[PDB]
């Protein structure tokens, strides 16, 4: 529908991940899968949520940028799902939610 701002900025590698979470305070990053209605439902929410805060965020293509995704999931210790979204505060993470537990009030839950 509308493009929310462009709020969410599509990442293509590990470089890229480790430079966003390093350069903002604050960062929410998304797994998201090109061929699931899940996946899609939850990935308005994060635009929705994004959108609405006024704040980048961030997304990969799990089965484009695997190396990435294996690495997210090393980098958490959360095994992998998708749709799965992830907060960051200080390049450390704090929150985790899966599938349609990803929506504007968990977003928001994870900032408290």
Known sequence: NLYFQGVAIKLS?????????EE??????????????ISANAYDQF????YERDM?????????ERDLSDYIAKKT??????????YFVNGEMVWN????????????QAEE
């Open 47 to 50: 635009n929705k949520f994004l």
């Open 77 to 86: 210790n959360v095994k992998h799902e998708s749709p799965q979204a992830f």
């Open 13 to 21: 590698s590990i470089d890229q991940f480790e430079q966003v979470i």
């Open 56 to 64: 980048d965020g961030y997304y990969l293509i799990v089965q484009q």
């Open 24 to 37: 903002n305070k604050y960062v929410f990053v998304l797994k998201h899968s090109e061929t699931c209605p």
């Open 97 to 108: 939610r899966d599938h349609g537990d990803i929506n504007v009030s968990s977003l928001a």
